[PDB]
Amino acid sequence: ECGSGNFRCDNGYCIPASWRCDGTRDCLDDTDEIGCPPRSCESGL
Amino acid sequence: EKVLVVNPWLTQVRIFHQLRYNQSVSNPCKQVCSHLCLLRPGGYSCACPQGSDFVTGSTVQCDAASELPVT
Numbered sequence: 001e002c003g004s005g006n007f008r009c010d011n012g013y014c015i016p017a018s019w020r021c022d023g024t025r026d027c028l029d030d031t032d033e034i035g036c037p038p039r040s041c042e043s044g045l
Numbered sequence: 046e047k048v049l050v051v052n053p054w055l056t057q058v059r060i061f062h063q064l065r066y067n068q069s070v071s072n073p074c075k076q077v078c079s080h081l082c083l084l085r086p087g088g089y090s091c092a093c094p095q096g097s098d099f100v101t102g103s104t105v106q107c108d109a110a111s112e113l114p115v116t
């Protein structure tokens with residue numbers, strides 16, 4: 001299995017968890033970035 | 046408007062200027078692939094040279110031997 005500090009693509013490829021939310025769809029799947037929280041701008045804006 | 050006239054051997058017009066292509070676009074590839082790192086919407090995708098396949102579905106390493114860059 002993948003390491004503690006390594007995110008997992010559901011195809012069985014383990015990638016460093018830094019790449020999550022880095023802004024590019026790193027897996028062969030898109031699930032490197034799917035489910036990332038959007039950048040917070042400001043309340044009421 | 047007519048710019049200029051040349052021989053009917055002319056095959057193409059191409060504008061040679063810095064702003065023709067956005068030179069500052071960031072290369073998304075992360076030095077993962079053993080051979081080709083092609084682009085795709087919002088990222089990249091590794092590929093093997095023609096005829097060679099990925100080893101045991103590694104999807105980064107191919108059976109092809111790597112070749113030195115040409116300068």
Ligand SMILES: *[C@@H]1O[C@H](CO)[C@@H](O[C@@H]2O[C@H](CO)[C@@H](O)[C@H](O[C@@H]3O[C@H](CO)[C@@H](O)[C@H](O)[C@@H]3O)[C@H]2NC(C)=O)[C@H](O)[C@H]1NC(C)=O
Pocket residue numbers: 067068069070071
């Ligand atoms: C040529 O491409 C460059 C990128 O290499 C363009 O610069 C960036 O364009 C994006 C998209 O329009 C902008 O968001 C960037 O501005 C900044 O982006 C960050 C997010 O990364 C925001 O937080 C900032 O508030 C700001 O909006 C812009 N800057 C860079 C270098 O990222 C450029 O527009 C483009 N130019 C031409 C001539 O096509």
Ligand SMILES: [Ca+2]
Pocket residue numbers: 019020021022023024025026032033
């Ligand atoms: Ca990413």
